[PDB]
Every structure is written in structure tokens, then in C-alpha cells.
Amino acid sequence: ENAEWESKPPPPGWRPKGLLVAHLHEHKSAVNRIRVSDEHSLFATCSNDGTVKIWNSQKMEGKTTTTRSILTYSRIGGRVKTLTFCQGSHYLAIASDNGAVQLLGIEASKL
Amino acid sequence: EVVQEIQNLPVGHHDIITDVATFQTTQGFIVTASRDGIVKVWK
Amino acid sequence: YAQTQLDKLKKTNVFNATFHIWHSGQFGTINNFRLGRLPSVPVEWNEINAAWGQTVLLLHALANKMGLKFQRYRLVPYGNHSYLESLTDKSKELPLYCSGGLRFFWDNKFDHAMVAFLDCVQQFKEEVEKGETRFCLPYRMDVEKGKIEDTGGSGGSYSIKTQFNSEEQWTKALKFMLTNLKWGLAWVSSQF
Amino acid sequence: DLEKENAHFSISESLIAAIELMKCNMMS
């Protein structure tokens, strides 16, 4: 009964005007998933080039500094085709097309 | 209830979009990604 | 998408894209600036100054590209105060910019500046036609009096000097000059 | 003469486009 459908980020984008604030272009072949974990203020994207890039939720504004990924990881291989942030825990999960599933502890506790 | 839709430098994506998320820190943003690797954080 | 972008770019002239010359129906336009002044359609002096400062830059670029050095005047493309400093004698200041509050008795400087620019364009036309007589510009010019003959129609002549002239004829003369510049640009780009 | 001038502008732009296309093709 206590659990809620509301995801990490409640809806404050009540009405998107269509304005753009960043044009992050680093992947090469095809992005096919996006996750957001506001508990750590991060969000992630995988693709078919074998990389799972982690960005920062506070650096997206790019109002002062440039916008670039905080981390990368391309050792699973194959074609990373899904991922999910682990709620209440400081790690991520990914599943390659090799048929491999692995965790990836994110060092967000230390800054 | 069938809600039909009928018709009477572009910043939009130029290829198939594959996801739409929404993260918020102070004012909610929308995140997207096309099949060519681009990512765009709307407001 | 890539094919569409390539097909668009392959026809994008550099000068034409930068300083686009077009018509508004009654105003000759450069980069969407209105080079004219009509009673039914007012034009603030700042817009006219910008239009002159852009036309000066366009003609300066074309002259440097062709290698021509104008006989009797020098073009100085200053942002919004461009002026022709008379080459033969560097004493007379000819500004292609007016500060409003016209005092025609003392503001002959702007008229002289426009006449000198018409002289430079006449020299440009002379070079273009002498190089190749097969190509002919659409309008004719006379520099002894500062006029543009309407060879594209009834043949009425128009003055480029605002003094002694109406606003409508002035705007039409500048439109003819801009058409001259566009066709000259086409020929210059083709020759290279 | 407004229509004639507009035709002049259109023809000039068409000629510029054709000339540039020919230049690019010769480059190729």
C-alpha cells in the first residue's frame, strides 16, 4: 500500500514549450534506452556502439560549463540493449547482446 | 474513446526517436534520443 | 536527408547567401533591410544606414575579388557609418549615413556620397561589359548627372540624390541599382 | 513594371543557381 507509481522525477514539465537547452551528441550508432535516477541526480543512455554513458542532471543546463558525460563504460561488449538504475542502491545494470548481464557500481557516494 | 488526429533551422530530430524520459532538478526537463546517437534535453 | 542537404548546398552562392538581394514589392532589400523611404511606409534612418553599410561591404568584397581598384574613390566599409574618402584628394568626407534632422542646405555630403557610389557602380559595369560584351546589365546608368535610365520599360530617368527629388523616385532608383548589383554579382561569380 | 522587375529577379536567381550547379559539376 505504501509504494507509489510516481517515478524518481515528479512532473514539473507540465507544459514543454519546445525549447532546447543541450545537444549532447557523443554516441555513434543507435541509442535505444534512457533511465533517470534522481536519488543520485544522474541519467544514463546505452546504444549499439557498446557504450553506456552516464551524464549529470545538474550539468545538463550547460548555462555555465560545457555539457559532456561524467563517465563511460564499454567493456561489456556486444550491443548494450537495456539498462535500469537500482532503486535504493548506488549501482546500475546493463544487458549486452552477448547474453551477459552485469552490475556497475557508480561511485556517487564519493565526489 | 478514439482521439484521432487530423491535419488541416529545425531543431527536431532527423531520425526515428527511441525514448522519452523526464528528469527534474528545479524545472522539469525532457530527454530524448534518436537512432543516430543524438540527445536533446528540452525544457 | 543527406541528399536533400547536399542538393541545397550545391546551389548556395556565397555572396548571394550572405548579402541576399531581393524585392519587397516596392523596397530593394539587402539581408532583409529596407533600402528605401516612402510616406505610406516609413523607414527609420538607422535601417537606411544599415542598408548602405551592407551594400558598401558587398561592393567592396566584389571589387577586391575582381581585383579592381576604383579610379577616383576608395570604399571604407565601416559598420554603420561607412563613407567614401575621395581618393584623389583626402580632404572631402562623403558619408553614406545620415543623422536625421535634415538640413538640405548643409547635408549635400550624403548626396555626394550616393553619387560617388553610383560612379563606382558605373565603373564596375564598365569593367564587366568590356570583359565580355555578350553579358549586359539590365539597367543603364549616367554619372555626369547621377541618374538611372529605365531601359527595362518606358525609359523614364530617376535621380539617386534625395535633394531636388521625390521619395518614390529615389526608392525606385535604388531598386534599379540593387538589381544592377545582383546581375553584376551573377556575372562576376560565373566568370571565375 | 513591377511584374517585369520581379521576373528579372526570378530569372537572375535561376541563372545564378544554374551557373553554380554547373561549376560544382565541373568540380566533380
Added chain:
Amino acid sequence: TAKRELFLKTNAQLTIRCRQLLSELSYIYPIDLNEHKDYFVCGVKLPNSEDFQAKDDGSIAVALGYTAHLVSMISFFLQVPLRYPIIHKGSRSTIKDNINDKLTEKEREFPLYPKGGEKLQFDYGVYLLNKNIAQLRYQHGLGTPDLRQTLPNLKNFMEHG
């Protein structure tokens, strides 16, 4: 696979033409240098942001207008949108700011030239222009050790591409 190879072939020619017609834009706008390390656009100076002070204003305004038009044309040819779009007017150009949340609708336009009383707004406008130049320089992979140097960065970008 065949169609993908053909697409890459086409993109090669597209970028070739892009640089071809970006090389001709130097026939209109020259960026120059002299021994004292001052920089000139069309022969008029444009020092770094801090060096504006205690100098003539008209030259600075004219140079900044030329720079604004040059950046706008580069972005147009490359098809790269700008986060603070520009409205070229000459010596009286302006740069917008549609992102900042701490401004009214009217306060989002700033002058890229010295103006009476609006010193801080003029400085913020020059800052926005430097940010735009850094954005363009960063899309291609180049760094920006210092953002106060307007022209040198732009000339380096032109030399690189």
C-alpha cells in the same frame, strides 16, 4: 550494408562542400593580426573582454557587429543552432538569452556594443557572444582555455575548419 556505404559516400561530399563554401567566407570577412598581438576584423580592433575599458567605443561596436554576423553565417552554413541566437544589425547587433529563468521577457535581449548606462548588460552580451563562440568551437572537438579572448578563438576555429 550496401545502402549504408552509399550514405557515407554522400555525407563525405556534403562535408566537402561545407568546408568549400566556408573557405570563401574569408574573402568577405578577414581576421588579422599584428606584432603587438592586437586583432582586427576588416581593419578595426576588438581586444579581449577586459581590455575594452578606457578605449574608443565605435570601433568596438563595429568589430562586434562583424563578429556577430560572421558567427551567424558560420552556424547557418554548418546547420548548427545557437543557444543565444543573434539578430544582426551592424554596429547595433544584439544577442538574446531565452534560458535564464531570473529575467523578465524584456530583459532577455542584451547589446553587443557599448551603450549609455547599460554597462553591465553590455558586458553580459559580450559574455554571451563568447559563450556562443566557445559552443561552436566545442562542437568540433576543440578546447577553450580562456573565454575572454573573442577573436583568437574564432580565428583558431576558422583555421581548424
